């Protein structure tokens, strides 16, 4: 299991590493939001060393193969255990890309987004 | 429970046959190559002009949705591309951009086959 | 007449004209990124009215001749010292065709398809 | 440092001798028609199987790259085709699709000369 699910604290970068770490901590027990945050981190162009660490740590040959597996888990999360109720009219591809983009824009511009109001919409408890 | 078979039979039905013709002719043309044939499938799925053919493939390949199917094809493409088989042909570029370029070049070819010669582009990948 | 660097939106109701305009205003400092947005706008088929206005406004006999000039300026901009430093052996024809495709993703679906972080890579 | 002043003296760089022979025979026949001369030059440059002859042409014509050479040929192609003296033979078709089909018809002939009569295709642009 190349994913098999954490904490890096490894030569990390500026504010952005702290903002990501705090987001991961609050939604650590949420598995859909965790992958969404990870996917935004991997897609984040301003986290190259953290991404390369995760690609190596998870035994993946490259970033694109890691990003592909995360998107895959994301779609299988949205395959109606619960959030088909929350999916509704929207397709899973735009919702994923909507959530990831909102996180990256929050990491880049934290003063401009209430990412908690966006993320806890997908909390089941 | 094999989701991706390499030998199979594509549907024969009402698929807006003019563009369905272009796809089937290129798949048959490059059925020799494993990577190139995989690229043609990707362009077909991403193409919004073929909602009948993909939904058949989505159902035929036991995938719950079109997204989960294109994700598997993209995964297989990166494996043959990023992991070295055609990596000697892959140069300074990233395996993502070359696929999204071949996918785009095919879709634009299917949409206007007289404005783009797709054959010589796909011939660039030997074997 | 020939191209050189007055364009205020369009006549009809399309909101995608607004997305193009704000990307243009933000990246006005960079010469290369503006042409990329222009070539992508012209290549965009959801913007036929704005494109036809630019064809006549820049006095070009056709759309193909207009897109041909922008591609020419793009390839030469990538030949300039600073941009050719960002080059890094990547093929000019493809990086332009990729950048074109990727902003049209943000044009059709701005809710996703992170765009600023993408072309912030081409800043300095 | 001029750009695309038509003139002969082309080298036919090195290997791919048969394809170079097919290209020269076409270039030699239609050398008095400017439009077809650039259509053949377009297909030659675009041809993935003439990399040595193209790189010479790029360097010889003092162009920074192959893509910048192909762009200049396309410009003169559309310039000559649409406006001055080919709107007549062009008629109602679109110039871009006409260039690429002629481009593709030449390349398809060069790769397999037995399956195409490129003379009949290219002769529709003589006798203005
Ligand atoms: Mg990243
Ligand atoms: Mg489709
Ligand atoms: Mg347009
Ligand atoms: Mg060539
Ligand atoms: Na924080
Ligand atoms: Na937080
Ligand atoms: Na601030
Ligand atoms: Zn980092
Ligand atoms: Zn269909
Ligand atoms: Zn418009
Ligand atoms: Zn050669």
Numbering used by the authors:
A (entry chain A): 369 to 373, 376 to 495
B (entry chain B): 368 to 494
C (entry chain C): 369 to 373, 376 to 494
D (entry chain D): 368 to 495
What text appears in the publication on this structure?
Thus, we focused on obtaining a higher-resolution crystal structure of the CTD alone. The construct encompassing amino acids 350–507 (SidD350-507) crystallized readily and diffracted well. The model was refined to a resolution of 2.5 Å (Rwork 26.4%, Rfree 28.7%) with good stereochemistry. Residues 350–367 and residues 496–507 have been excluded from the final model as they were located in areas of poor-quality electron density and were most likely disordered. Despite extensive in silico analyses, we were able to only find domains or regions with weak structural homology to SidD350-507. Automated ion placement in PHENIX.REFINE identified a hexa-coordinated Mg2+ with the classical octahedral geometry formed by the Oδ atoms of T417, T421, the main chain carbonyl oxygens of L411, V412, and D414, and one water molecule. In addition, upon closer inspection of this region we found a second metal ion, which despite not having a recognizable coordination shell, was identified as Zn2+ based on the clear Zn peaks in anomalous difference Fourier maps from data collected at the zinc edge.
Taken together, our data revealed that the CTD mediates localization of SidD to membranes using a dual-binding mode that combines a general membrane-binding determinant in form of the loopCTD with a specificity determinant represented by a helix-turn-helix unit at the C-terminus.
